[PDB]
């Protein structure tokens, strides 16, 4: 369990994807030319995970995105062969990404995926970044996943999927596309970090006091969360080391693998962080719902499993104390029938900008609130049958929408069942 | 459908180095353990031996050497049970070389009267018979009915009786039984029917009533007449109660 193949699909996919590579290239001490100018061994200890030059494949039906990446800061480092791009765009139609246009290109993508996997000592799994309200990131992404799932069934599938919100785009077909994609991810991926644009806006607007957040502002919150959750994977460490071990200790029931991520402290784009937080302060950004990257209240549900990643030089004695504290002083919020369900890990190398930081990966039943929002919007749209002729024209059947609607509601019911469960 | 389709097992690799000297040793318990090991550890487990390219006619000719000549009755008993296992788990193999290598030794050793030993020798002779039909046994079984030991007469004649009950050769007529019926089979069974001992004669009486059942109580009415009226009603006694 060593290498990870990375994929980014759709506009958002390549945006937060490149942003992720910007962050972790710095953290590992790699320049845009692809040469090591670091000064520590803890950096190159597990550089073979994401690098060889990135093990990254760039995909979009929109050919313009090609240039938006290469003209970016670290755009020079990506392998030219790993660029696979179509002629036209999907235009927010999941069916075009999943059945028609995205399907015609998906073969060319699998050829590059094969090429990168072929020269791997021992593959771990895959990593996809994309948006769920689009046509390419959702439609072609979910189609790529299934196509990989069946070509590489001995590997983990881990996605960074961002949820659409009216606060970021007023397109009304997004409830359709996202619901159809959740119907896919619940069956096709081992673990999925739920990035909610609703929560990214509410954090940039209310906590960071930015009146108009841009994509870059929301993308800053994402790339830092990604580097936080992938800290275990990229540096030496005992706990939650590889993709499979993580999912083993996080996902008790296969369908309930949608994590509510959140991290601290919340900083602005390049602002000045004069006063470093204390260990008890970081700890009290867990239940603090203003730090969750998903728009849910942990107080309204119960945690099945929790993984905490503390970055920076600090007292391991104090972290253990604070985590053991916050668990038992809120014992009614953690499920009793899974003992030692919270797991903490420390990494001495902090993220750039911060002296200390802490990311809070949680499988909380409160996540059902997120799926409620998508379902109510989907049903409001679907009961009036709006814009269906787009999807049906591309070969989809009206039945598909009803199945995805019901399958997501079953997923909501499941979360509610284990919320009301008792150990007795 | 025949359950015999099971994959074949090989036992040559199972043999130990200290086997050839142990079986050809002067100490009885060396020989016993040698045979008893390859039987309980190597033969008894298996259920189908390897038909293809396996020569057992080196192993089988040393089972014959002991069944015939070995003075230890215990080493004989465990050897004839080994011989049976080979003939049982490897059906259709004992065509001539194999069948004939142990046949005439087995018939010599029917002389043994210990119940357990006669049990094993006869049961082994039943194995070679059921898989060598009438190839070499029919001629040689007769030869040993003419033998001087009383016990080999009654046992080799009982053998022909056993075989005759399981006689179901293919074809309408002109089998090996008819080519030599009156010339040899009947002339030899009468030597048993007219023996000095009663228990010997009484085996012939069955072995003649099992013969009539096969080949018609009318065809053999010629030597029936030459027989005593007193022996006749004993032969008929078995004819009424004997099946094939």
């Amino acid at each position: 369990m060593r290498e990870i193949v990375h994929i980014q699909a759709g506009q958002c996919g390549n945006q937060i994807g490149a942003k992720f590579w910007e962050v972790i290239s710095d953290e590992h001490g790699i320049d845009p030319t692809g040469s090591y100018h670091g000064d520590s061994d803890l950096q190159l200890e597990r550089i073979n995970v994401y690098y060889n030059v990135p093990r990254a494949i760039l995909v979009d039906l929109e050919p313009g995105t090609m240039d938006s990446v290469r003209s970016g800061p670290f755009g020079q480092i990506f392998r030219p062969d790993n660029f696979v791009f179509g002629q036209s765009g999907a235009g927010n139609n999941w069916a075009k990404g999943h059945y028609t246009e995205g399907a015609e290109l998906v073969d060319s993508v699998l050829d590059v995926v094969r090429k990168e996997s072929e020269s791997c000592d021992c593959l771990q799994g895959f990593q996809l970044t994309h948006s769920l309200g689009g046509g390419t990131g959702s439609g072609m992404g979910t189609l790529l996943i299934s196509k990989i799932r069946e070509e590489y069934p001995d590997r983990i599938m881990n996605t960074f999927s961002v949820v659409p919100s009216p606060k970021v785009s007023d397109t009304v077909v997004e409830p359709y596309n996202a619901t159809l994609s959740v119907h896919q991810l619940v069956e096709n991926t081992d673990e999925t970090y739920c990035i909610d644009n609703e929560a990214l806006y509410d954090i940039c607007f209310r906590t960071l006091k930015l009146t108009t957040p841009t994509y870059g502002d929301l993308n800053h919150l994402v790339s830092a969360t990604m580097s936080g959750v992938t800290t275990c994977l990229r540096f030496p460490g005992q706990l939650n080391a590889d993709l499979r071990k993580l999912a083993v200790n996080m996902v008790p029931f296969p369908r309930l693998h949608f994590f509510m991520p959140g991290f601290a402290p919340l900083t602005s784009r390049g602002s000045q962080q004069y006063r470093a937080l204390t260990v008890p302060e970081l700890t009290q950004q867990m239940f603090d719902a203003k730090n969750m990257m998903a728009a849910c209240d942990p107080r309204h549900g119960r945690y099945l499993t929790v993984a905490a990643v503390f970055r920076g030089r600090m007292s391991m004695k104090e972290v253990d104390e604070q985590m053991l504290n916050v668990q038992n002083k809120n014992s009614s919020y953690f499920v009793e029938w899974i003992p030692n369900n919270v797991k903490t890990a420390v990494c001495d190398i902090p993220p750039r900008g911060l002296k200390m930081s802490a990311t809070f990966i949680g499988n909380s039943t409160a996540i059902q609130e997120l799926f409620k929002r998508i379902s109510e919007q989907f049903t409001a749209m679907f009961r009036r049958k709006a814009f269906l002729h787009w999807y049906t024209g591309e070969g989809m059947d009206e039945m598909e929408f009803t199945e995805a609607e019901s399958n997501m509601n079953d997923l909501v019911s499941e979360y509610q069942q284990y919320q009301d469960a008792t150990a007795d | 459908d025949p359950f015999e389709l099971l994959p074949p097992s090989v036992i040559l690799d199972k043999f130990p180095a200290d086997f050839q000297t142990r079986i050809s040793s002067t100490k009885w318990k060396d020989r016993v353990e040698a045979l008893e090991e390859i039987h309980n550890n190597v033969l008894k487990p298996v259920k189908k031996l390897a038909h293809k390219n396996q020569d057992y006619s080196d192993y089988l000719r040393v089972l014959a050497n002991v069944i015939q000549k070995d003075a230890n009755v215990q080493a004989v008993t465990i050897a004839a049970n080994s011989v049976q296992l080979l003939c049982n788990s490897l059906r259709s193999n004992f065509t001539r070389s194999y069948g004939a290598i142990v046949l005439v030794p087995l018939l010599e050793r029917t002389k043994e009267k210990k119940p357990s030993v006669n049990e094993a020798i006869c049961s082994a002779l039943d194995a070679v018979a059921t898989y060598c039909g009438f190839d070499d046994c029919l001629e040689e079984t007769l030869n040993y009915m003419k033998h001087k030991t009383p016990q080999v007469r009654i046992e080799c004649t009982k053998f022909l009786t056993r075989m005759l009950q399981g006689w179901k050769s293919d074809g309408p007529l002109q089998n090996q039984l008819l080519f030599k019926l009156l010339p040899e089979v009947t002339t030899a069974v009468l030597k048993i029917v007219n023996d000095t001992q009663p228990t010997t004669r009484n085996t012939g009486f069955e072995c003649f009533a099992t013969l009539m059942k096969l080949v018609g109580e009318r065809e053999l009415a010629d030597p029936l007449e030459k027989l005593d009226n007193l022996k006749k009603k004993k032969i008929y006694e078995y004819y009424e109660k004997v099946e094939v």
């Binding site: 059945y99 069934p153 070969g395 | -």
Partner: protein, 247 residues
């Protein structure tokens, strides 16, 4: 649009498949020389692997109705068909994740199985797929093998001993396979062999080699089975058998 069945755009192939499906139901039973999807079976062998999941499913239901329009005389050329057709059907039809794409592929194999004299020419072609990467394929094609038996069965099969050995060989590995479904659906195939032979035979060659918990479940499964050791009447007949019954 006859040659458009190989056209570049998907939605024009989707038509040609519907056009064909309407033809094989509305064409003549005696059959137009236009019905030449027998002498060149590479054509539909290509169509079943359409490269478009929606137009694929429509090619399979066209093959399906084709493959029952052929139930009339003289079509002794069903040998060539099973060779050309069921490897694509198993490889990429049973494989499919689509509800309907799978269901019609199985039904197709049914019709190709009863085109044959027995089940032998069908099993030997779909046996290799048990050794495939994808579990849901071996998960499925063990279910499909199991129901070409429960409805047809072994009759008119030359040398059955060679055939039973060929299908019993992988059953140890299948029952120790990682996938839950591959295992669960292998105990069903074991029962369907028990349901047709005795318990004596399986326990001598196979049951010995499985996990103890497994052979318990197989025994528990035989008690719930009621009916004579070989089934008295098959739930489905072949083509030469039904015609013989009629005359």
């Amino acid at each position: 649009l006859e040659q458009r069945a190989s056209h570049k755009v998907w939605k024009a192939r989707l038509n040609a498949y519907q056009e064909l499906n309407n033809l094989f139901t509305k064409s003549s039973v005696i059959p137009n020389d236009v019905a030449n999807y027998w002498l060149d079976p590479e054509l539909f062998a290509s169509y079943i692997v359409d490269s478009n999941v929606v137009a694929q499913e429509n090619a399979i239901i066209a093959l399906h109705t084709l493959l029952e329009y052929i139930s009339q005389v003289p079509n002794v050329s069903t040998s060539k068909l099973r060779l050309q057709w069921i490897p694509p059907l198993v490889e990429k039809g049973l494989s499919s994740s689509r509800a309907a794409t799978k269901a019609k592929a199985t039904d197709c194999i049914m019709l190709l199985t009863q085109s044959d004299t027995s089940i032998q020419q069908t099993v030997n072609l779909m046996l290799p797929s048990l050794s495939n990467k994808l579990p849901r394929l071996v998960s499925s094609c063990v279910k499909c093998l199991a129901t070409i038996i429960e409805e047809f069965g072994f009759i008119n099969v030359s040398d059955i001993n060679i055939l039973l050995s060929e299908i019993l060989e992988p059953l140890p590995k299948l029952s120790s396979h990682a996938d839950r479904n591959v295992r669960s659906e292998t105990m069903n195939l074991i029962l369907q062999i028990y349901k047709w032979f005795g318990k004596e035979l399986l326990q001598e060659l196979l049951l010995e080699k499985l996990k103890p918990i497994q052979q318990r479940d197989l025994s528990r499964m035989f008690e719930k089975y009621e009916g004579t050791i070989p089934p008295k009447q098959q739930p489905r007949l072949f083509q030469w058998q039904k015609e013989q019954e009629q005359e």
